[PDB]
Structure 1
């Protein structure tokens, strides 16, 4: 019972990060993939593509917003009442139920498809971290105006946590040269993806 309860309690994170994994495949409200290079903001073309997700999480809504429909009501089958114990040798069944699902809040406030690394001050750090940063800083909306995005969240798999910490947390990057992204975006651990 308690094991199933803890599994159910963990479930929402699995749901959210499964949707995050599928972000390169799932489609946002525009009609293209959440992380795609052909977002149709205008008759022109706009693009936002280890499945990381730089996120500002500062606007009125956050990316990959969760939707809690039903709690983890425990489902049990431990009484002869049912036909499981009739047709079988006293097989009881213990279950947890959920009624939730992930969401794709906005595909113009996230970015993915990273060739992440922290070799050189910029020539390898701005390869992805600063491309996401400046792209979001200058994402345009209807009416040719900036979205005023403030990227301050970085979600990466476990393998990339060391590189993320080096990018944000150390004055020098990998050669004792410099690190323009120090104390810029706070990274968080995650293993549900990759």
Structure 2
């Protein structure tokens, strides 16, 4: 980003701009089941045949699993900065910032979405039917059905994601006011090059099923856990999930 517009006295400094190119490779995924050719026809209840097509459902569910596995690895994996995605020592130009059960506060309305996926190739269906493989002539009457995948997640922006919470709701001054509102303040206090704000607007809260009720209490009820107050009511809408932890 550009340097901040400075004051003018006698001459203009011809500043420069940095670049943070991020590299990430691709991984390949597959799941296949071996079945007997004779058995699929040798049925009357219409079962053991749809299972080969169930690879489509498995492939459809795959991208969620991949993205949430990368989300789990967020603490372990490294972002473009060279540090962990959820790290307390994120290197900013003048100084070092810090963003570090299974929480994550993300923006949703920004031009970028955190943990961006990559549907590089579709859920192509791989099959082993008859005189197309050797498994069925110079072998038993075996058939395999497979779903090839060539996708992978990405660590997009480690300066807008925050994790490692003791996510809690009580006393409105020590548990939520000091953890969830702490994350709120940290995300909204993020500064880019030149000291300008990133316009971070935390509106996504992702937690596993274990924290669903407590996240709903943090966002949804006027009183937090003792009848005191709930400053974070209708500020971040939480979506439940189970792929992580």
Could you say which TM-score interval applies, normalised by the shorter chain?
over 0.9
Unaligned runs of 5+ in 1: none
Q: Deviations over 1:156-192 (max 9, x none)?
A: 0100000000000000011111100000100001000
- Give the 4+ runs in structure 1 shifted more than 6 A: none
1:83-106 deviations in whole A, cap 9, x for unaligned? 223454211000011111101110
CA contact (8 A) 2:56 2:123 kept: yes
User: For the structure 1 residues 123 and 77, does the alpha-carbon distance in structure 2 shift closer, same or farther, using more than 3 Å as the test?
Assistant: same
Provide the rounded CA distance (Å) in 2 between the counterparts of 1:92 and 1:19.
33
CA RMSD of aligned residues (A): 1.2
Task: Give the TM-score, by structure 1 length.
Answer: 0.96
Instruction: Count residues in correspondence.
Output: 194
CA deviations on 1:31-82 (whole Å, 9 max, x unpaired) are 0000001101124221110221101122210100111111101000121432
- For structure 1, which segment, 56-65 or 178-187, has the greater mean C-alpha deviation from structure 2 after superposition? 56-65
Structure 2 unmatched runs, 5+: 1-51
Q: Under a length normalisation based on structure 2, what TM-score does the superposition of the two structures give?
A: 0.76
Q: Structure 2 CA distance, aligned partners of 1:169 and 1:191?
A: 21
Partners of 1:87 and 1:53 lie apart in 2 by 53
Between structure 1 and structure 2, the one with the greater Rg is: 2
Cα contact 1:75–1:96 (8 A) shared by 2: yes
Q: Is the 8 A contact 1:18 1:192 kept in 2?
A: yes
Is the Cα–Cα contact under 8 Å of residues 122 and 179 in structure 1 kept in the other structure? Answer: no
